[PDB]
Amino acid sequence: EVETFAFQAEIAQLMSLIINTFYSNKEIFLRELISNSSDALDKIRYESLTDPSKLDSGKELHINLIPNKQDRTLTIVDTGIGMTKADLINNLGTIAKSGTKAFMEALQAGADISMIGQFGVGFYSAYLVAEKVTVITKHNDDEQYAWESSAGGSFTVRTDTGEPMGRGTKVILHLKEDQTEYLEERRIKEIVKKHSQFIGYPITLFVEK
Ligand SMILES: Cc1c2c(n3c1CCOc1cc(C(N)=O)ccc1-3)CC(C)(C)CC2=O
């Protein structure tokens, strides 16, 4: 069963601004998604100190960057804490509403789109390069879910039927026709070195063929 939900007004407004505003510094999307992955890895690592059984779903704490030219997708995989059904539909949207308001206020005041992460809504920077974003996630206290949105004011949530993940999040970016540079090895390496060189987890850039 595929469930369709309307984004809260502020989030729809944020997504429209990201999609329609002329802003050439699109590469910052990668540091934002890597930061979301790093925060999720920090959470599962901290939780495992008071409860070691929380690592039964996987001990390895890493980030994988998977480009696919055939499918025109860039996947950001992590073995972080993951997200529950409540996080995907309710919780994160509530936190994102207040963050969006502060960000849109800052933009009006003179701030730029690259400051998005300071407002905890960095995930949405994915729409600078992607026409569609698919989020596959598995949290210890819940089932494997697939969140998906091509913006337009709606998102879908379904129980995932694909390859079981163990624990973590996969952010699949269905790239815009003119944003294929983010599938090139040399371009991804450059971006990771420039904005994500001090991430406290191994970042593996998968190569194609
Ligand atoms: C806020 C927000 C939002 C999402 N994330 C965040 C910030 C903190 O939680 C996340 C964690 C990870 C991860 N790698 O574990 C990825 C994305 C997110 C994703 C969303 C629920 C589909 C939409 C949203 O509104």
UniProtKB/Swiss-Prot annotation:
Protein origin, superkingdom: Eukaryota
Region (Interaction with NR3C1), start-end ranges: 1-209
Localization per Swiss-Prot or TrEMBL: Nucleus; Cytoplasm; Melanosome; Cell membrane
Entry comment on modification after translation: ISGylated.
PTM-bearing positions, type N6-acetyllysine: K43, K69
Binding site for ATP: N36, D78, K97, F123
Notes on the domains: The TPR repeat-binding motif mediates interaction with TPR repeat-containing proteins like the co-chaperone STUB1.
Family stated for the protein in its record: Belongs to the heat shock protein 90 family.
Function: Molecular chaperone that promotes the maturation, structural maintenance and proper regulation of specific target proteins involved for instance in cell cycle control and signal transduction. Undergoes a functional cycle that is linked to its ATPase activity which is essential for its chaperone activity. This cycle probably induces conformational changes in the client proteins, thereby causing their activation. Interacts dynamically with various co-chaperones that modulate its substrate recognition, ATPase cycle and chaperone function.
Subunit structure: Homodimer. Identified in NR3C1/GCR steroid receptor-chaperone complexes formed at least by NR3C1, HSP90AA1 and a variety of proteins containing TPR repeats such as FKBP4, FKBP5, PPID, PPP5C or STIP1. Forms a complex containing HSP90AA1, TSC1 and TSC2; TSC1 is required to recruit TCS2 to the complex. The closed form interacts (via the middle domain and TPR repeat-binding motif) with co-chaperone TSC1 (via C-terminus). Interacts with TOM34. Interacts with TERT; the interaction, together with PTGES3, is required for correct assembly and stabilization of the TERT holoenzyme complex.
Protein name from the UniProt record: Heat shock protein HSP 90-alpha
